[PDB]
């Protein structure tokens, strides 16, 4: 597993227990600035090693299992440079409200295609979503915990306030096979939004429900390295 992203990523073929519905999720805390600073909100979220290592200096505030279906979301706050409450979606299987205008939030697990071919994944932010896909540019196969801080350059990723807060990644897959994926997710202020959707060259479709999709596999001893 090369850490590089690629057209054509690596995947993984789990052996005899059953991959268990969903991506693991990790929310993490993100603090406003001091009040009376200019912007009000922290540039943090954008040091170079926040998604690596500096996120996980601010307060844990859940693990979860079991992430699935549709992720989207959209959370309007009322004003900017306030913490608000808000809830995320019910497919996040996390029923206690958070501070929804200023959160880090990351998921991780394995993509199974339904089709081989050319998957095109579309994303949106407000504030930040960069995209790990593939073994050794996400995690290596049922070797994640060893693996999980070494991600590579990302597949995709979006920030508002960019030209656009858009990015496609277009990657070929074998259907069947679990390919590793890592989303890490923050908003910095006010409003917040995550897309994730794909299309594929079978058909006009779009995919949003990731009910089918999304999967988490134990580590194993020897690890489950892609054996088509
Ligand atoms: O529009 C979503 C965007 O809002 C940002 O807050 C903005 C701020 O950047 C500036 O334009 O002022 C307005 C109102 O005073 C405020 O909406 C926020 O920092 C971003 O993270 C986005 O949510
Ligand atoms: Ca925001």
Redesign the pocket.
Known sequence: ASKDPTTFPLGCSPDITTPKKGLSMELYSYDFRKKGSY?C?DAAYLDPNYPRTGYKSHRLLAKVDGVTGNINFYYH?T??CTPQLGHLPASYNYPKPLTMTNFTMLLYGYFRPKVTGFHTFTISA??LLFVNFGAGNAFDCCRRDSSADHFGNYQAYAI??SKTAKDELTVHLDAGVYYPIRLFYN??????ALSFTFKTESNENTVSDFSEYFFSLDDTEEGCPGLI
Do not use: I, T
């Open positions: 912007p909100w706050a004003k900017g407000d504030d508002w306030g908003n910095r202020d006010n409003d917040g």
